[PDB]
């Protein structure tokens, strides 16, 4: 059941960390992928594989798991992304085990059906990221680590008082999301609880003032960027907002909605814009991820089941293709020796299919119709225009700068006059490219099939913002 798929990446990452060899972690990530896909298929509903086990009888904490329509596809998304990061990595430092561990942790996080277990996994995911950051690369590693970690922790620790208030002040017997939603909070207490939720959920989104950790995190990881991909999969802020924060304390979100929509708009614009000014792949992708998270947050904050489903879908798919771009940058580093955008321009003629792969990925990033980004982007546009048309329009001065920075980077890396010549492709990179393009094309052409579980959750939690 669910717990088996949740735990499989954890045990495989352990067997890569202590045990040998590196190669087994690739097929371990593949098995996680297959089981998560099997759970994604034949999925009856949220309860699909319900799991309830005693953890803290006296305190009221139980292991609560199950695949929603949200949990199912997020399982599949993370399994796939980490499987790519396992096969193509070329890090092979024996911290691919750390990567698989973080995968299993993210799976449990999404499978969390109770607030305290959700919180526990949210805080636990910090350790692998910090390690694969610290000991496997980076010179400003220690300071980037302190920045990212201290930001996450200062945001998170008050959210423990927020969840304690959400359970106690509502008279909820346990931390189960079912019970917590069955006991809603009143005005000027749900206010403080939603504020305590929104601090952590915005700093982990990230939004405009709180994104200052994202470039330092992305730069100083292992140059292959497996740690960077897994950190981009760690941007669950939108999922937490939609699932827990707003449904648990909508009264505060009612006042904060204008501010949140505005922040999301400015984040999207600022990220897509500064990404142009970015001179390196890590910073560029950091600001790109900031812009995408801004759009997703806008979609969720608009209410508007359209915008909400758009935000969630955009979140999953942006995690996917951003991790792919990270692994691609890491492989080009392993073969060349630099992450600079200006140098080594001749790539297009020397690289037969890396040009086409990076182009596919950047097009999926800039939100081109037919690829994964556009469905979520358009639903978010609709919902944001519904909620605040002005903020929707401001947020969507983003496609321009997106296409700008993406085409600029692609051209100056590949198209121009031939240099020395570059290695063509690795055998693992071949499967990486094929599967990445396959997933991107499927999620772009059939956003109907996927997110079918997302539509009921979106419309229900958007109508929750009504009377």
């Amino acid at each position: 059941m669910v717990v088996l798929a949740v735990l499989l990446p954890v045990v495989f990452g352990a067997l890569l960390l202590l045990g040998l060899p590196r190669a087994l972690g690739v097929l371990g990530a593949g098995l996680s992928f297959l089981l998560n896909l099997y759970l994604f298929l034949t999925h009856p509903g949220g309860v699909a594989h319900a799991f309830q086990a005693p953890l803290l009888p006296g305190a009221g904490v139980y292991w609560a798991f199950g695949l929603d329509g949200l949990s199912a596809l997020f399982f599949l998304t993370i399994a796939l992304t980490v499987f790519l990061g396992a096969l193509v990595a070329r890090v092979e430092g024996r911290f691919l085990g750390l990567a698989l561990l973080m995968e299993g942790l993210l799976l449990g996080l999404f499978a969390a059906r109770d607030l305290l277990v959700f919180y526990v996994f949210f805080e636990a995911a910090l350790i692998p990221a910090l390690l694969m950051l610290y000991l496997y690369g980076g010179e400003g590693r220690t300071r980037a680590l302190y920045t990212f970690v201290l930001f996450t922790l200062v945001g998170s620790l008050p959210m423990l008082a927020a969840v304690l208030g959400a359970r106690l002040l509502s008279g909820s017997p346990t931390f189960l999301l079912e019970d917590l939603l069955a006991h809603p909070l009143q005005e000027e207490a749900a206010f403080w609880v939603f504020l305590g939720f929104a601090l952590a959920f915005a700093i982990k989104t990230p939004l405009f003032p709180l994104h200052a950790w994202l470039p330092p995190f992305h730069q100083e990881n292992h140059p292959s960027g497996l740690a960077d991909a897994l950190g981009t999969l760690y941007k669950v802020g939108v999922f937490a907002f939609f699932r827990f924060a707003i449904p648990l304390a909508p009264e505060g979100f009612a006042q904060a909605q204008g501010l949140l929509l505005f922040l999301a708009a400015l984040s999207a614009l600022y990220g897509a814009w500064v990404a142009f000014a970015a001179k390196d792949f890590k910073t560029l992708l950091a600001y790109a991820g900031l812009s995408h998270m801004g759009v997703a947050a806008l979609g969720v904050f608009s209410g508007t089941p359209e915008g909400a489903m758009g935000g969630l879908y955009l979140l999953a798919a942006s995690g996917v293709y951003t991790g792919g771009l990270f692994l691609l940058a890491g492989r080009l580093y392993e073969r060349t020796g630099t992450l600079e955008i200006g140098r080594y321009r001749g790539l297009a003629q020397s690289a037969p299919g890396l040009a086409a792969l990076a182009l596919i990925l950047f097009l999926a990033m800039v939100g081109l119709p037919g690829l994964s980004g556009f469905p979520g982007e358009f639903l978010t546009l609709l919902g944001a225009y519904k909620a605040s048309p002005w903020l929707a329009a401001l947020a969507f001065l983003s496609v321009i700068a997106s296409a700008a920075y993406a085409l600029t980077a692609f051209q100056k890396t590949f198209w121009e006059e031939g240099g020395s010549g570059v290695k063509d492709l690795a055998g693992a990179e071949w499967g990486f490219a094929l599967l990445s393009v396959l997933a991107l094309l499927l999620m772009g052409v059939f956003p109907g099939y996927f997110a079918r579980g997302l539509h009921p959750l979106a419309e229900a939690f958007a109508k929750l913002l009504g009377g």
Binding site: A278, Y385, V399, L407, G448
Partner: protein, 605 residues
């Protein structure tokens, strides 16, 4: 279900030529491309003869995948597929010994499939899908020869402008989703008839749709991206400027004719923008010393003509001009491409001249083209331009100044077309061309193109003669009509237009054989060569300041991170002050202890 194959064929072909592609001999990719284009043209014409087609499949909730093939959709489909097959054959000819044959014809198949997705759509989101696909294929083909930086930034600018227009499109679509909730053009028109609501919001949505159409068809201000498409190979420039990627602007209005027909201010604005685009494209045309640019500016001028027609409400007339233009401009471009394949890519005007006798069938092609553009009294270009001139007065919104404006623009189109032909084929000799000037499979489809350019013509003729195109176009869409008409005086106007076109042809002939170019004309020709200094002001206050603002925001983010560091250091400083609180003297420790204890005892109350 069968309708999907029309798109799928030059997608499977694109996939073959992209993936394997180079596993084939040199002609085979182009042959496959042209054969798929032909056996898609045929299988779509069979469906059109079967009365029409419809397709609906599951997609985004509330936004299904809806394809409608009607009279209006089939007209565009046949135009695109036929000209695409002709330019495919011409590209099989023109591309030789050049690496990336596979890439070129895969991109061609992709372009064809994307344009089909655009035109065959019952939903504005599917229209937008086709829009961005055509923009991407245009970027790719313009940047086909990547080893040159010049022919990459061109495509970059093209796609950036295109995505600006596409963002306007998206905003209009979000408006016509917040308003109605259908976003399927059919049910949206049926929901837009009757008591319209929020007229400000409706006019705004129509204005955003027009904003997208402007970027796509290279109207003002977003015109600037079209000329640099000369960077792309000549058959690419032909397909972009004649049959695709610009016609979509007029098609959006003709499909939204129900929306624009109830937007008088918006339709008047469309007419004004079309007039200005024609005037600019004509004025800045002849000064250009490159054949590619001097033809691209004529493209801009003629697209302005079409947009004026569709703006005054003359949707079928705009489509008539689209038809004639797609013929004769493809003729022009393929003629120019054969010319520069004869001169080894010289691609200049002042380096040309006296190609009349040496070039068989190319003087004929270029002359047929120049005359169709100038409006030869019995030619498709003449019929279309003058049907526009008549629809100006006949259709609503007055057309008073627009008539004389379009007449002067026709004069200028005659003049610069004659400048093109004169400076290219007549009145000196320069350069070298030994072996091979005329190839078989370039001029053979160009022969048919000249044929079609000549004989497009009489499908739409003033009402004594049969207007076949109008009853074909009116019923499927552009339903709402309010047009007056006259006789006797309308034919006097036709005579005035024909005589003025002849006078403009001979005026360009003499002026551009002259080479005298008096004082003011030299300045004018230089200004037209420099496109009237538009990019200079675009990069002065817009592009470079946006770059500087991006850098400024980056530095601002850096400083924000530094302030976060400052906060951490303030915390540390406080911590070391509290550690300095412990000096190490026992008397100090005991005093602080007694102090804290008294503080607690006071707090207890």
């Amino acid at each position: 279900m069968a309708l999907l194959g029309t798109i799928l064929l030059p997608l499977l072909g694109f996939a073959l030529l992209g993936l394997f592609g180079k596993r084939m001999r040199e002609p085979l990719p182009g042959v496959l491309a042209s054969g798929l284009v032909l056996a898609s043209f045929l299988l779509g014409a069979g469906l059109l003869l079967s009365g029409g087609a419809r397709f609906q499949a599951e997609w985004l909730p509330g936004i299904p995948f809806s394809l409608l093939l009607d009279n209006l959709s089939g007209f565009m489909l046949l135009i695109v597929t036929g000209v695409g097959f002709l330019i495919h054959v011409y590209a099989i000819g023109y591309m030789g010994g050049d690496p990336g044959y596979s890439r070129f014809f895969a991109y061609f198949n992709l372009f064809i499939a994307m344009m089909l997705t655009l035109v065959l759509a019952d939903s504005y989101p599917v229209m937008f899908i086709g829009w961005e696909g055509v923009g991407l294929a245009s970027f790719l083909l313009i940047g086909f020869w990547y080893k040159n930086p010049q022919y990459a930034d061109s495509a970059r600018k093209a796609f950036i402008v295109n995505r600006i227009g596409d963002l306007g499109f998206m905003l209009g679509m979000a408006i016509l989703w917040a308003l109605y909730g259908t976003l399927s053009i059919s049910e949206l028109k049926e929901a837009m008839e009757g008591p319209l609501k929020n007229p400000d919001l409706l006019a705004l949505a129509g204005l955003l749709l027009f904003l997208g159409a402007v970027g796509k068809s290279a109207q003002i201000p977003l015109m600037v991206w079209l000329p640099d498409a000369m960077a792309g190979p000549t058959p690419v420039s032909a397909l972009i400027h004649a049959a695709t990627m610009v016609t979509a602007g007029v098609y959006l209005i003709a499909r939204s004719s129900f929306l624009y027909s109830v937007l008088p201010d918006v339709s008047y604005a469309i007419a004004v923008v079309g007039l200005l685009t024609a005037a600019y494209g004509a004025l800045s045309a002849f000064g250009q010393t490159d054949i590619k640019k001097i033809v691209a500016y004529s493209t801009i001028s003629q697209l302005g003509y079409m947009f004026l027609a569709a703006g005054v409400g003359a949707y079928w007339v705009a489509l008539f001009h689209v038809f004639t233009h797609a013929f004769f401009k493809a003729l022009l471009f393929l003629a120019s491409g054969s010319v520069i394949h004869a001169l080894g890519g010289e691609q200049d005007v002042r380096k040309m001249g006296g190609l009349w006798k040496h070039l068989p069938q190319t003087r004929w092609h270029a002359l047929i083209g120049a005359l169709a553009l100038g409006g030869l009294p019995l030619l498709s270009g003449f019929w279309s331009k003058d049907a526009i001139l008549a629809a100006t007065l006949t259709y609503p919104f007055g057309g008073v100044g627009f008539y004389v404006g379009a007449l002067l623009v026709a004069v200028l189109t005659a003049m610069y077309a004659m400048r093109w032909f004169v400076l290219v084929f007549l009145g000196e000799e320069r350069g070298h061309h030994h072996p091979h000037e005329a190839p078989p499979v370039m001029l053979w489809p160009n022969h048919l193109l000249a044929l079609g350019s000549v004989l497009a013509g009489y499908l739409a003729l003033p009402h004594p003669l049969p207007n076949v195109l109008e009853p074909f176009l009116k019923p499927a869409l552009a339903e709402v009509e309010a047009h007056h008409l006259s006789l006797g005086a309308e034919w006097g106007l036709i005579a005035l237009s024909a005589a003025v076109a002849l006078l403009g042809l001979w005026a360009g002939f003499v002026f551009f054989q002259r080479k005298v170019f008096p004082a003011w004309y030299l300045a004018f020709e230089a200004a037209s060569r420099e496109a009237f200094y538009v990019d200079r002001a675009y990069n002065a206050l817009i592009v470079n300041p946006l770059k500087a603002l991006a850098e400024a925001l980056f530095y601002g983010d850096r400083g924000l991170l530094s302030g976060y560091f400052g906060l951490g250091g303030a915390a540390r400083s406080l911590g070391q002050g509290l550690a300095r609180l412990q000096t190490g003297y026992l008397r100090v420790y005991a005093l602080l202890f007694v102090l804290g204890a008294l503080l607690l005892l006071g707090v207890m109350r």
